[PDB]
Amino acid sequence: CGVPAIQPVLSGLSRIVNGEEAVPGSWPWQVSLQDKTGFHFCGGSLINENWVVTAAHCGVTTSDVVVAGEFDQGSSSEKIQKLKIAKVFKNSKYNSLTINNDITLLKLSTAASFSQTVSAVCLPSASDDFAAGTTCVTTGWGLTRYTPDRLQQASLPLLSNTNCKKYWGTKIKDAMICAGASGVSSCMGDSGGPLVCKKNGAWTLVGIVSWGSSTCSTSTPGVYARVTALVNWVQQTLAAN
Amino acid sequence: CGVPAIQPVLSGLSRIVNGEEAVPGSWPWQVSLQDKTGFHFCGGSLINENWVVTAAHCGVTTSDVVVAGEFDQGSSSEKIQKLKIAKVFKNSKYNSLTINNDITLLKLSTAASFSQTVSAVCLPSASDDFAAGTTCVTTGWGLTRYTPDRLQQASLPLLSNTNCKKYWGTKIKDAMICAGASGVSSCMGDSGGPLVCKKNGAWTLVGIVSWGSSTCSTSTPGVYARVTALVNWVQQTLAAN
């Protein structure tokens, strides 16, 4: 997991304004969630050939579908895999008013076929520490909510929850983590999309997109579900099903 | 339906600032949705002894519960009914990015017992016309998201969808309706709460709360699910289940 067959390239422009375009196929766990009509409404991450993780406020159902191996949403020429959803597992502790514990798992009807452009992100262990100030990366097609149709990427630093409350106040709970406010926006992340950090030569999922600045301000950070706080529920669900 | 045993009293102050307090028990279809721990996160409306209607973005599950007959959320002295949910029916056309077709039905495990303070709102027919400029009423405990703990009410006018787009642009779809921007806020409505209008001596459900001004501005209107566009799906669901 976490070692793309096609290595990412991140330059100085990933750190300012709205980030930069990714090298095609270099984020191979990134998937798109689409409704029965093909409309993209959220993102997510592959964790093995049978399972995808996303946000609970996305409200996914078994009539939505997972699209793997995509780079350009406007192209019909690249190889992709459209995968049906057998069952949806929403975390029972999710709360639609506070948006805390914002995670859902999707079990696929038939496995994805892994390749150079389709493979899994690594999950953290519950006790991993990702320190404030660490440079991490968010990817997605989130800018298309307001524009480039190819996958974008931005490098931005994690914040402490105390510093995040200087921006968002009592909205910030223990199962959340924030990143950004460094001269770059967080809006390229789709709801439910990945925030990954590189440790020991492997990329690991640290956050899941929950919400960001309503004006995509370069001085307001994004808010993510904290995966370390939820990975135990993830592994219990996989083992029981 | 739609004829409270205890008549509402609406004064001139229902029309300015943040509205006014309701006469206790005078909105008898109003219910509160709470999680398994008793935390209020949304509103809804009784349509008979076995069924409640609310918003789909509330994300209700069968472990949440319906509370009927409530006036003061801070009191333990008033009679109320706590009702279990047997099954949740989300409208398959709901979309969590656009927030269109924002309606869900809840079927109760055991019927509510109707009384002077607990009874049903009337549903419109699909072809009813509620004209722009009509004064309607929104009720709820929505102000407690930012404060009074008793049920509030405000009188505010419906807008045309074209005039609403001067405020919200391409967010506004055909299955939505807007009200307010007249010197009074819409924020007393809980997510999923009622917008009712009085015709022929009976109160009828015209809207379900979807979203409002992020600053509760007295000059920005609220956005509601248009019940006339969704009542056919409601009646099909009741007949099949």
Author numbering:
A (entry chain A), B (entry chain A): 1 to 146, 151 to 245
Give passages from the manuscript.
ChTg is the precursor (zymogen) of the mammalian digestive enzyme chymotrypsin (CHT), one of several well known serine proteases. Firstly (in the digestive tract), trypsin cleaves the peptide bond between Arg15 and Ile16 to yield π-CHT, which is an active enzyme form. Secondly, π-CHT molecules autolyze one another to cleave the bonds between Leu13 and Ser14 to release Ser14-Arg15, and between Tyr146 and Thr147 and between Asn148 and Ala149 to release Thr147-Asn148. The resulting α-chymotrypsin is formed by three chains tethered by disulfide bridges.
